[PDB]
Enzyme design. Sequence first.
Site, PDB file in Angstrom:
ATOM      1  N   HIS A  72       0.786  -1.239   0.000  1.00  0.00           N
ATOM      2  CA  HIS A  72       0.000   0.000   0.000  1.00  0.00           C
ATOM      3  C   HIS A  72       0.819   1.291   0.000  1.00  0.00           C
ATOM      4  O   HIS A  72       0.266   2.390  -0.103  1.00  0.00           O
ATOM      5  CB  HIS A  72      -1.135  -0.047   1.011  1.00  0.00           C
ATOM      6  CG  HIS A  72      -2.433  -0.460   0.381  1.00  0.00           C
ATOM      7  ND1 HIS A  72      -3.380   0.487  -0.023  1.00  0.00           N
ATOM      8  CD2 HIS A  72      -2.863  -1.695   0.017  1.00  0.00           C
ATOM      9  CE1 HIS A  72      -4.363  -0.211  -0.594  1.00  0.00           C
ATOM     10  NE2 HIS A  72      -4.088  -1.519  -0.613  1.00  0.00           N
ATOM     11  N   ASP A 130      -8.206   3.327   8.574  1.00  0.00           N
ATOM     12  CA  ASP A 130      -9.531   3.380   7.918  1.00  0.00           C
ATOM     13  C   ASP A 130      -9.782   2.161   7.042  1.00  0.00           C
ATOM     14  O   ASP A 130     -10.930   1.768   6.849  1.00  0.00           O
ATOM     15  CB  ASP A 130      -9.698   4.659   7.088  1.00  0.00           C
ATOM     16  CG  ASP A 130      -9.530   5.938   7.910  1.00  0.00           C
ATOM     17  OD1 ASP A 130      -9.876   5.923   9.116  1.00  0.00           O
ATOM     18  OD2 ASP A 130      -9.079   6.945   7.342  1.00  0.00           O
ATOM     19  N   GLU A 241     -13.835  11.429  13.100  1.00  0.00           N
ATOM     20  CA  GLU A 241     -13.165  11.860  11.881  1.00  0.00           C
ATOM     21  C   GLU A 241     -13.933  13.021  11.265  1.00  0.00           C
ATOM     22  O   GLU A 241     -14.994  13.398  11.749  1.00  0.00           O
ATOM     23  CB  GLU A 241     -12.990  10.702  10.881  1.00  0.00           C
ATOM     24  CG  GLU A 241     -11.895   9.744  11.299  1.00  0.00           C
ATOM     25  CD  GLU A 241     -11.288   8.864  10.225  1.00  0.00           C
ATOM     26  OE1 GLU A 241     -10.565   7.918  10.598  1.00  0.00           O
ATOM     27  OE2 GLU A 241     -11.526   9.109   9.023  1.00  0.00           O
TER      28      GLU A 241
HETATM   29  C1  LIG Z   1      -3.567   1.846   0.289  1.00  0.00           C
HETATM   30  C2  LIG Z   1      -4.127   2.461   1.549  1.00  0.00           C
HETATM   31  C3  LIG Z   1      -3.253   2.882   2.551  1.00  0.00           C
HETATM   32  C4  LIG Z   1      -3.725   3.448   3.747  1.00  0.00           C
HETATM   33  C5  LIG Z   1      -5.114   3.603   3.931  1.00  0.00           C
HETATM   34  C6  LIG Z   1      -5.986   3.211   2.907  1.00  0.00           C
HETATM   35  C7  LIG Z   1      -5.521   2.634   1.731  1.00  0.00           C
HETATM   36  C8  LIG Z   1      -6.524   2.213   0.677  1.00  0.00           C
HETATM   37  N1  LIG Z   1      -5.658   4.101   5.123  1.00  0.00           N
HETATM   38  C9  LIG Z   1      -4.823   4.425   6.092  1.00  0.00           C
HETATM   39  C10 LIG Z   1      -5.384   4.933   7.363  1.00  0.00           C
HETATM   40  O1  LIG Z   1      -6.565   5.122   7.604  1.00  0.00           O
HETATM   41  N2  LIG Z   1      -4.439   5.214   8.330  1.00  0.00           N
HETATM   42  C11 LIG Z   1      -3.062   5.047   8.196  1.00  0.00           C
HETATM   43  O2  LIG Z   1      -2.349   5.343   9.151  1.00  0.00           O
HETATM   44  N3  LIG Z   1      -2.535   4.585   7.002  1.00  0.00           N
HETATM   45  C12 LIG Z   1      -3.373   4.305   5.998  1.00  0.00           C
HETATM   46  N4  LIG Z   1      -2.862   3.836   4.814  1.00  0.00           N
HETATM   47  C13 LIG Z   1      -1.398   3.757   4.629  1.00  0.00           C
HETATM   48  C14 LIG Z   1      -0.869   2.435   5.179  1.00  0.00           C
HETATM   49  O3  LIG Z   1      -0.954   2.367   6.604  1.00  0.00           O
HETATM   50  C15 LIG Z   1       0.586   2.247   4.751  1.00  0.00           C
HETATM   51  O4  LIG Z   1       0.701   2.323   3.330  1.00  0.00           O
HETATM   52  C16 LIG Z   1       1.404   1.100   5.352  1.00  0.00           C
HETATM   53  O5  LIG Z   1       2.653   0.957   4.685  1.00  0.00           O
HETATM   54  C17 LIG Z   1       0.719  -0.242   5.548  1.00  0.00           C
HETATM   55  O6  LIG Z   1       0.473  -1.028   4.379  1.00  0.00           O
HETATM   56  P1  LIG Z   1       1.243  -2.386   3.865  1.00  0.00           P
HETATM   57  O7  LIG Z   1       1.098  -3.661   4.586  1.00  0.00           O
HETATM   58  O8  LIG Z   1       0.662  -2.347   2.456  1.00  0.00           O
HETATM   59  O9  LIG Z   1       2.829  -2.336   3.814  1.00  0.00           O
HETATM   60  P2  LIG Z   1       3.871  -1.949   2.617  1.00  0.00           P
HETATM   61  O10 LIG Z   1       3.237  -0.831   1.894  1.00  0.00           O
HETATM   62  O11 LIG Z   1       4.148  -3.214   1.845  1.00  0.00           O
HETATM   63  O12 LIG Z   1       5.273  -1.562   3.261  1.00  0.00           O
HETATM   64  C18 LIG Z   1       5.321  -0.346   4.061  1.00  0.00           C
HETATM   65  C19 LIG Z   1       6.750  -0.042   4.465  1.00  0.00           C
HETATM   66  O13 LIG Z   1       7.097  -0.848   5.615  1.00  0.00           O
HETATM   67  C20 LIG Z   1       8.031  -1.849   5.255  1.00  0.00           C
HETATM   68  N5  LIG Z   1       7.536  -3.120   5.782  1.00  0.00           N
HETATM   69  C21 LIG Z   1       6.499  -3.887   5.312  1.00  0.00           C
HETATM   70  N6  LIG Z   1       6.227  -4.931   6.055  1.00  0.00           N
HETATM   71  C22 LIG Z   1       7.158  -4.854   7.083  1.00  0.00           C
HETATM   72  C23 LIG Z   1       7.398  -5.660   8.214  1.00  0.00           C
HETATM   73  N7  LIG Z   1       6.746  -6.797   8.472  1.00  0.00           N
HETATM   74  N8  LIG Z   1       8.366  -5.265   9.072  1.00  0.00           N
HETATM   75  C24 LIG Z   1       9.067  -4.158   8.795  1.00  0.00           C
HETATM   76  N9  LIG Z   1       8.954  -3.340   7.745  1.00  0.00           N
HETATM   77  C25 LIG Z   1       7.968  -3.739   6.926  1.00  0.00           C
HETATM   78  C26 LIG Z   1       8.175  -1.802   3.733  1.00  0.00           C
HETATM   79  O14 LIG Z   1       9.449  -2.244   3.291  1.00  0.00           O
HETATM   80  C27 LIG Z   1       7.831  -0.343   3.430  1.00  0.00           C
HETATM   81  O15 LIG Z   1       8.962   0.515   3.551  1.00  0.00           O
END
Ligand SMILES: *Cc1cc2c(cc1C)nc1c(=O)[nH]c(=O)nc-1n2C[C@H](O)[C@H](O)[C@H](O)COP(=O)(O)OP(=O)(O)OC[C@H]1O[C@@H](n2cnc3c(N)ncnc32)[C@H](O)[C@@H]1O
Length: 477
Positions: A72, A130, A241
């Site tokens: 995401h 959310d 919100e």
């Molecule tokens: C797409 C989206 C995002 C979103 C949202 C609604 C949508 C449709 N609503 C949010 C909300 O109400 N409140 C909020 O705080 N954030 C909201 N978001 C954003 C979302 O939280 C973030 O995009 C977040 O990154 C979580 O999503 P995801 O699981 O998809 O993780 P990622 O995008 O692949 O990676 C994020 C970063 O963290 C590192 N990463 C990933 N997994 C890990 C683990 N297990 N341990 C350590 N680091 C990790 C990735 O490498 C990257 O840098």
Amino acid sequence: DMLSPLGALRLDGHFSFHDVSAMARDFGNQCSFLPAAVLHPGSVSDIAATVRHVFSLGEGSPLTVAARGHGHSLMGQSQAAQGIVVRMESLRGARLQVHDGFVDAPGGELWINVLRETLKHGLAPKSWTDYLHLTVGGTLSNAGVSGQAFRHGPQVSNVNQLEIVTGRGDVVTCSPEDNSDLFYAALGGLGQFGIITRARIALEPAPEMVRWIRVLYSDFESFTEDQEMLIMAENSFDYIEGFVIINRTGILNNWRASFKPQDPRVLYCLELTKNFNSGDTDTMEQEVAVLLSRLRFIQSTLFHTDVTYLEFLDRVHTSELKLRAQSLWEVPHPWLNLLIPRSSIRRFATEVFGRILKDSNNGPILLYPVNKSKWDNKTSVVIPDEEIFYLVGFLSSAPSLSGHGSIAHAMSLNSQIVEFCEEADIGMKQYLAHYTTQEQWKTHFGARWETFERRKHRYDPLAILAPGQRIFPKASL
Ligand SMILES: *Cc1cc2c(cc1C)nc1c(=O)[nH]c(=O)nc-1n2C[C@H](O)[C@H](O)[C@H](O)COP(=O)(O)OP(=O)(O)OC[C@H]1O[C@@H](n2cnc3c(N)ncnc32)[C@H](O)[C@@H]1O
């Protein structure tokens, strides 16, 4: 060949060295970085072995490791150009335990799945995002903020233990009581200090239902004063919100499809919930009547609906299904997410909503305050220095190649907002930031930079982890 000894590791899972396209994209739908390999881990040992191997190569290797959650991230933060992407969802299963009012969840587990399990015991996490189709590790690497943060703090304030694979390949169990510096570093840590493989999340008894309320305001001052009063009140709403509605007509008619009216220019929507159980509906009705009686919204705009706790928490998944049906889910998302101090909120709103922005048709504008006292000062989170600050989310889509929206148009509007914040000294901090240079990151972190940098040398000295964040280039420390 640096990727042949990688193929020689005796993994529980396996590496993919050619079929890697799915890990070269994210929700942002703008950046694409092909990795050299994709680890599908069969255990945390696979992750540790992969990290140990890359670390064993020292400064003479360009290999990086990015943990991918649900992808995401908006600007390549979960990607690794010619590196190794770790598919965290390959470990979702599997090691999900509810005990003592807590849930132990794999890092790659989606919040929706944590909730579905937890509800079987009549329990649920206290603080949300959310959207629930996000990983535990992904949201904790940021903060995880929604309408409950004013009371329980963000998700990062409701975690008790983490199991992490550091940038050295060590597997560490940490908490505020043991290896606490690593624990606090990882929270809002942007994947910089290790991969969260497991998290202990605090739970509370779950209600069976929610009274979901929406009302409109014409005055920003009254809108925000009411939000601030609700976030400071005792026995207030369970979710608070707000949304900024620019130009749009037929807003009450759009609500009429889901919400019951009571009874039938920039506008402001205040969104509230009151949690309740079927056997205690009359107590809820009385408590809600009292709480609403102190508010200054336009009375004719009061809309409400009674739904299950799950239906309210998973509400954004309904919008996802509608967008997927119209092929509008995988479009570019040039979002802008800001944290604005209370003292600058009115000056921000005047210029941004009154001048810079003409419509809000290509996405919602979230606007709501939180209490700084619910956020721990030891984490890697970056927030304004006031007791009350606002989350302002410009959640735009760019469904067009030209004109109104249009990544170029959204990007110009975002630059104008950020340039205004800088010129008018608003004291803004970005949430889900995408800076490209370490100098921009040093300024973002400010007084917290030294702490962030010392934690980096401690846990990921070779800068192997989460290169998409663009804070520390490989072997730069
Ligand atoms: C797409 C989206 C995002 C979103 C949202 C609604 C949508 C449709 N609503 C949010 C909300 O109400 N409140 C909020 O705080 N954030 C909201 N978001 C954003 C979302 O939280 C973030 O995009 C977040 O990154 C979580 O999503 P995801 O699981 O998809 O993780 P990622 O995008 O692949 O990676 C994020 C970063 O963290 C590192 N990463 C990933 N997994 C890990 C683990 N297990 N341990 C350590 N680091 C990790 C990735 O490498 C990257 O840098």
